């Protein structure tokens, strides 16, 4: 624009002409002068001028406020409670529209992470993502998605458009590998197995109404229909759909990645995969 024309007229830019942005630096004040010297802002002789006032929270000898209030367990066990990041249907629809997630293929945590759709902190006790009903009315996509937790209304929205949603469990060690797979391959170790849910979480993941990954497949057809009746839509049949194979794809309950089995080694340097030939090893991984 016109600004660059000004440069042509003005003298050369050099190390003798530099200037900071105005107001970017304040002035630091030393106690030399009369305004800021003498008593130097500390007051008259006492404990505070000399520099030895009591600590924060001390009230002069009466029992302090933060210790006269009774103890109660608001934060008991906080470091052991499980955490799930929320993913709303507004956010999911937004991501598909801009092309940062590919709806043709199945969607799992790895694909969500790779598109910056979600940020996962395993060291802060994140165990995965839960689908949230907000934005359900305007969801107009057909997809295959796997999440750790789901809500009643969120499941309805996905399926009404002819899609599949399922709930799956990952352990702390597996979750770290899932989010950042490439650094694991650089280590040179075999892929580990996936542990089953703790005892308390077994009822949730073996229940059809939750779309669990360990529930009886025979009972799914009944559950899907009842949602259609309750929320007033017609249950579509996906077997007719051309993409039935994609929508039906599901991984083994002891598998982390779709096309890879426990016990394999990924040699990324020369694009090869190594498999063990020992019966004891094969039996261990397959169990």
């Amino acid at each position: 624009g016109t600004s660059l024309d000004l440069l042509r007229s003005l003298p050369r830019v050099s190390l003798a002409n530099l200037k900071p942005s105005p107001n970017s630096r304040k002035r630091e004040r030393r106690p030399r002068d009369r305004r800021r010297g003498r008593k130097c802002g500390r007051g008259h002789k006492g404990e505070r001028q000399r520099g030895t006032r009591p600590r924060l929270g001390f009230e002069g000898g009466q029992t302090p406020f933060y210790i006269r209030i009774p103890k109660y367990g608001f934060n008991e066990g906080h470091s052991f409670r499980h955490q799930y990041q929320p993913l709303s249907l507004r956010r999911l629809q937004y991501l598909i529209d801009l092309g940062r997630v590919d709806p043709t293929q199945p969607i799992d945590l790895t694909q969500l992470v790779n598109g910056r759709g979600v940020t996962i902190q395993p060291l802060k006790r994140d165990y995965g993502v839960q689908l949230v009903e907000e934005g359900a009315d305007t969801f107009q996509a057909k997809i295959n998605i796997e999440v750790q937790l789901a809500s009643e209304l969120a499941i309805a929205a996905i399926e009404k458009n002819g899609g599949v949603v399922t709930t799956a469990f990952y352990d702390p060690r597996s979750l770290e590998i899932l989010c950042k797979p490439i650094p694991f391959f650089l280590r040179g170790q075999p892929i580990p197995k996936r542990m089953l849910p703790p005892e308390s979480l077994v009822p949730y993941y073996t229940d059809a109404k939750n779309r669990g990954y360990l529930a009886d497949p025979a009972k799914f057809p009944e559950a899907r229909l009842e949602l259609a009746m309750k929320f007033g839509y017609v249950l579509p049949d996906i077997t007719k759909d051309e993409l039935f194979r994609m929508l039906s794809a599901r991984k083994d309950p002891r598998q982390i990645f779709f096309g890879l089995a426990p016990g394999w080694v990924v040699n990324m340097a020369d694009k090869k995969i190594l498999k063990p030939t020992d019966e004891n090893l094969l039996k261990y991984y397959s169990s």
């Binding site: 801009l98 096309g259 890879l260 090869k272 995969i273 498999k275």
Partner: protein, 132 residues
């Protein structure tokens, strides 16, 4: 005999896992506005003196901000050309709603415009009409 057998066929799944470094360009849609609400810049470009560019995420750069805990403002950021012309248009567009001329700041060095009060939704719709 070695204990490992090497196969090259299954590496395709590993290739899927690789993450990208560049933001993908949005995909073409038959019907706009897109179900979320996103709408791409219109073609041909507007002929106004000032041009407003989009962010790396392909959104209109209008932001709500606060300071001191009680001062509410809205910001239009990536302006090229004559920033002063844009100020005149914003004052005319917003003046009837307020009942007074809005208070504004123009930053020529950073090419941004700052307005007192929250007017992000109206400005976003207003800019789309002009087709930036």
């Amino acid at each position: 005999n070695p204990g490992f057998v090497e196969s090259v066929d299954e590496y395709q799944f590993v290739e899927r896992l690789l993450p990208p470094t560049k933001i993908p360009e949005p995909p073409k849609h038959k019907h706009y506005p897109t179900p979320s609400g996103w709408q791409p810049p219109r073609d041909p470009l507007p002929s106004l003196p000032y041009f407003v560019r989009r962010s790396r995420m392909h959104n209109i750069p209008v932001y709500k901000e606060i300071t001191h805990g009680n001062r509410q403002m809205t910001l239009i950021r990536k302006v090229e050309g004559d920033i002063w012309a844009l100020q005149k248009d914003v004052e005319e567009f917003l003046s009837p709603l307020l009942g007074k001329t809005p208070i504004t700041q123009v930053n020529e060095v950073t090419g941004t415009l700052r307005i007192k009060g929250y007017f992000d939704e109206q400005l976003k719709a207003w800019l789309l009409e002009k087709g930036f």
